[PDB]
Chains A and B, each alone.
Chain A
């Protein structure tokens, strides 16, 4: 007899055992080298899906741009980006009519937010493409570098501390004859108008790793800092709009998505009488981002912001204006090998414009030949369409408009449709009195989608009777069925620290028990395995064992020293008291009454040199990138113990010409620590104002010395010493 697990589906329905079809117990695919090939392929594919448009050359950037809008209507089922302006404007108008007051309200709240938003909001972001160094750097670092360059060039309106003023300075920089940047190898280099325009309109391309569910790798993009404020405002407007649309599912979580899917299916099927047939289409959109033209987003926003202050319209329109002229950096480059001479070489992507094509294979040779005409200063113009879901929410708005355009008031026919859209994925429930009606409805829905630059993937889509469908790895079969294979990768040690890892693991087990219908015995097994892996990872074994490690000696002496050994934490080699009933309690508090007072005091000592807290945002928040989803943050319950240390940093900056960044880091951190000691609320509430550091610090020294004498340790001798030391630092700052 030959064993075959798949035959199990002959008795258990597919959805009731779908977890077996998710090989999420092995290493996910990773990219190894350059992503330049993928970037070039994506650029060429985006440009050839809109080949029948019209070509122009921008007078500012001098780059060739392709406009397919209002182009010839498609005559085949292949992907097409020839969106029609009038059709999309009409779709938005019908969306407004079905939801009166949506645009005006959303614009009002967006106007409030834009005129009260601060610059620091831009620091709350992941890697961004700093143009000062032409590389990806943390959002805060890139923002600081750009602000420094602007201030050095004379653009100091951002000193007002307002994001709108920062954007005003950004736009004013576009009209400058010559800017100056700094490079280390420090050298001051001058950038002319066109070079700075291209550096501000460019995107950095990388390869996406840890992407499960496809054989081929893809490319993703990261924009600069000049354009992120406009993107933030536009996405704020789009989120405020989608929050008023029940057909959208992008700005919500997973459980809300499931609830809305259940509600829509029940509404569609229940209202349908015996005569009407119902069919569900589990649709995926092929080349979703490559076929969405930024000009159409400009049209949608300018229709949304009608009868609004002109400044609001301008600030919200700046973003799509820059995306329509966006450029993409090709990537890291290409690495060649010569086996005859036994050597390797790494050529940067910027040489692709001039480098001969003898080194490249046929596929890459043709890709380079096709993309060369669009190469301007080492970057390729990508006007026709978006690169990687930067305007997720606006795309969801367009999809929701398409979904609502079939409310049976615009169809003008017996058939009708509804459903749920989340960018690149949708479920469409279509009802009609007969199979011919369903066919006509789906055909018209597809045709209308093709008029908006949205394509339906026929290969990854199928239609059945309502009651069974899929949506973003959520399988609905007369009710959503748990999978538990999507969350399997999150059952190990997170990698934050000991206490954080313990709390995160127990909380993940608890949550997957609540949401993903994890069984009790399975949860107990998960707890046991997690504890085993945790002890084997942090070298913290039970203590009563003879497992020799680098940490087994101190742990054993602590074990023999303690009297009530049941109170020792698993991190210190103690027994595990966790169970299904204790999954919502931190380890420290669960073992508090069992700890010896000496060990308890040594553990939770504020003066410990290991605990370090930076800001209110990073107290008990851990960023865990979930499998098959975007990066997410979790609140984990933990007590600040000596085990809450933060791990070592990379330390490879020491071998790079960018070595002075570490000295600047140290000096900035010293100044920030001094300010915090002067202003204790610096971390919890970020200080605001327009004065400089030393003014506030010296003046508060004055006052605090005064009052702490009026009652406290200070003495006249010390108070006068502080006053004249303040005068000394004053005259020092003078010179």
Chain B
């Protein structure tokens, strides 16, 4: 039958009908009479629509061939011959522009004169039944319907026929051409009734070929095919198989509970080796401040001018000389770098306006100090294979180092009060609710407690230094840059003040990965002689740069004044995390506020004021040789703030591992102290897990010592 559509109809219509065939997903080889019927429907749609044009009037202009002009409007514009999505697109667009009603089924054409749709259907059966059939299929329709049938008859409601009658003679001539051409073909044994509305399909997902063999190799050891295994599974029913293997399984497979008593836990062993060194990016306990007493705010001002003005406030400069060498570098380079920094600072002082940011010369001194041109050149393996020295990067456990007493004192003095306010908080919306007033009063109390704390000063120092370093690295990637360490505080009298700890020289910072390292050299003034705790300054070079006179009742001290100079490095991640050190304030004060709220849930009243003023209640916050010492809530605030600050400063994988594996043991010990009969399956394994995190970090070793002390004081 398909030979007929090969022969007669034009290409355009046959591929339109083929795409309509693909539309609903049925195959053309099984039933083709539908293809012919609907392609004839589509053909009558065209032949009825084309050759029919309109101009600004009604009364369509009919031309056998559209002449070249702007007057190519089509009388009837076709609906079908398009995908369902576009057919409904045209339906909705016509409804929204023509203000007509939206039909629920697919029309075939639209006309302007009568401003409505045409649903053309030419069926094998006579018209006077198919018409009202499709009419009762369509609900309350104003779209006019018109149908032909092979006998040659026409019909329509309203007795309406919308265009010329010679066109309809055309239609029925086409119709009988179709008819008495099948006459030569002979199809009416099924042509009248060939489609009955079949819609059914079964989804087929068959495993075959290579993928089947893979299925045959992904079974238990004693199975040969997926078919057999699935049959076995379907036939499988529970018949007490877990019990049999449990009985047969060796009894050494057990989870015996070892009781956890007061005498069970042993102190954590600390590693032994050379004392632990300093790792901070700046001096914490041995910092010195040169000040100007200016009225500018933290960010307000220009760095270089402030630094120069602060440094001019000090008199007593001496020619620098080596006091304590780096022990691994070239100290003369550090000396020359310091003198170069001074010289270029003067050079800025001379000229017209202090630059906002200064670049330094790339001398051999800072080329060595900043580690320039030291990365091995990257080459290909095929060119370097016979080199005996060629091997992997050194990948082994870090060097072992024992704890020293300097970190303990540094933390002790990091929780001490100061003679300045190191936090100038921002603005918030004016409090409107009583709860907001309570929150503001609490916040004011904590700010009064923690602002005068060395932890806040360290927070500001780190934030400013890391912000400046990151910005300089991102801006001046190539050229070495000078950045004075600046921090602005407020005195007890209320006068604002600036403080200059020293200088940082940032080097080449072409940082691609988050782990890539930018090297800088840090110089900081101090008065602490490095000849008393040399092991804490393994990586520092310390010079003697001047003498300071601070008013004291013992005449006047006239102390020496040294310069701690070192080469340090950071990374994008480290800079970003060090510039978010202000969340240590959060951590600490959230803990304290949780304490206050928990206690106030007992007594139905806010308990902040008496906690902060009466200072009756105290918490164990340290141990003295006499015994455990307790301090007021403010001291707890400062201690927790210092702990968070040191966590942010000495952060490392060792800290994370020890924190987790020691929190586990802390929970076990707490369960013991709560009389909850705690038990363990392998306590030695937990101890070994904790002890492997303690390698060389001073902070984690101090935490381990604190944990041992807590165990000793606990378990009683």
Contact = CB atoms under 8 A, between A and B. Distances in A.
Interface string A436-469: 0011001111111011000010111111110110
Contacts of A518: 590
Interface residues of B, number: 191
A37 to B, nearest CB: 8
A171 interface: yes
A338 B376 contact: yes
A69 B85 contact: no
B156 interface: no
A720 B72 contact: yes
23 contacts: A16-B595, A67-B220, A74-B253, A298-B219, A299-B233, A307-B234, A336-B381, A340-B388, A340-B389, A343-B376, A343-B379, A344-B375, A345-B384, A359-B390, A447-B249, A459-B689, A463-B678, A519-B590, A520-B438, A525-B586, A545-B300, A699-B82, A704-B93
Interface in A460-484: 460-465, 467-468, 470, 475, 482, 484
Given A87-B245, A338-B391, A578 B429 contact: yes
Indicate the member of B436, B642, B693 with the most A CB atoms within 10 Å. Answer: B436
B707 A6 contact: yes
Nearest to B424: A532
Contact of A338 (B249, B250, B390, B666): B390
B8 interface: no
Which 6 A-B pairs rank lowest in CB-CB distance, beginning with the nearest? A26-B651, A459-B685, A215-B657, A520-B439, A521-B442, A324-B218
A174 B590 contact: no
A6 B514 contact: no
A439 B384 contact: no
A296 B591 CA distance: 47
B436 A25 contact: no
A401 to B, nearest CB: 11
A580 B436 contact: yes
Contacts of A19: 587, 590-591, 594
B714 interface: yes
B218 A298 contact: yes
A4 B432 CA distance: 40
B676 A464 contact: yes
Contact of A56 (B208, B217, B649, B656): B217
B171 interface: no
Interface string B673-712: 0101111111001101100110000000001001101100
Interface string A303-334: 10011010111110110111011000000001
A325 B253 contact: no
B221 to A, nearest CB: 5
Nearest to A534: B426
Contact of A707 (B69, B94, B390): B94
Given A70-B220, A459-B685, A541-B299, A548 B356 contact: yes
Contacts of A484: 587, 590, 594
Contacts, number: 548
Given A87-B241, A579-B432, A700-B89, 11 more contacts: A3-B622, A7-B621, A14-B669, A69-B220, A193-B210, A197-B210, A484-B594, A576-B428, A579-B436, A710-B98, A716-B71
Given A320-B218, A464-B676, A8 B619 contact: yes
A40 B317 CA distance: 60
Interface string B508-528: 000001110000000000000
Interface string B200-236: 0001111111110111011111100010011001101
A415 B471 CA distance: 64
A158 B84 CA distance: 20
B533 interface: no
Given A3-B622, A322-B214, A93 B238 contact: yes
Contacts of B296: 546
Interface in B601-625: 619-624
Given A302-B233, A338-B376, A579-B429, A215 B692 contact: yes
A18 B663 contact: yes
A70 B86 contact: no
A10 B206 contact: no
Interface stretch (A28-36, A183-191, A604-612, A639-647): A28-36
Indicate the member of A17, A23, A312, A336 with the most B CB atoms within 10 Å. Answer: A23
Nearest to A699: B86
A21 B429 contact: no
Nearest to B411: A3
Contacts of B123: none
Contact of A9 (B90, B93, B381, B666): B666
A245 B376 CA distance: 58
Contacts of B706: 4-7
A212 interface: yes
B395 interface: yes
Contacts of A70: 220-222
B633 to A, nearest CB: 11
Nearest to A549: B299
Interface in A501-515: none
B245 A451 contact: yes
A711 B97 contact: yes
B377 interface: yes
A266 interface: no
A22 to B, nearest CB: 7
B538 interface: no
A448 B246 contact: yes
A19 B250 CA distance: 43
A481 B464 CA distance: 35
Interface in A151-169: 164, 167-168
B408 interface: yes
B300 A546 contact: yes
A76 interface: yes
Contacts of B193: none
B255 A446 contact: yes
Interface string B645-684: 1011111111111011011101111110010111111100
Nearest to A532: B426
B256 A345 contact: no
B446 interface: yes
Contacts of A520: 435-436, 438-439, 442, 593
Interface string B319-351: 000000000000000000000000000000000
A299 B582 contact: no
A657 interface: no
Given A26-B651, A314-B207, A294 B440 contact: no
A97 B669 CA distance: 41
Contact of A7 (B73, B620, B668): B620
B163 interface: no
A325 B233 contact: no
Given A8-B636, A338-B390, A536-B299, A91 B656 contact: no
Interface string A111-149: 000010000000000000000000000000000000000
Given A3-B621, A458-B681, A545 B297 contact: yes
A548 B300 CA distance: 7
B249 A451 contact: yes
Contacts of B134: none
B10 to A, nearest CB: 15
Nearest to A344: B376
Contacts of B595: 12, 16-17
Contacts of B640: 5, 20
B233 A575 contact: no
Contacts of B19: 691
A345 B378 contact: yes
Nearest to B112: A710
A575 B427 contact: yes
Contacts of B204: 311
Given A26-B655, A73-B245, A324 B238 contact: no
Interface in B577-603: 577-587, 589-591, 593-598
Contacts of B245: 73, 84, 87, 451
A675 interface: no
B556 interface: no
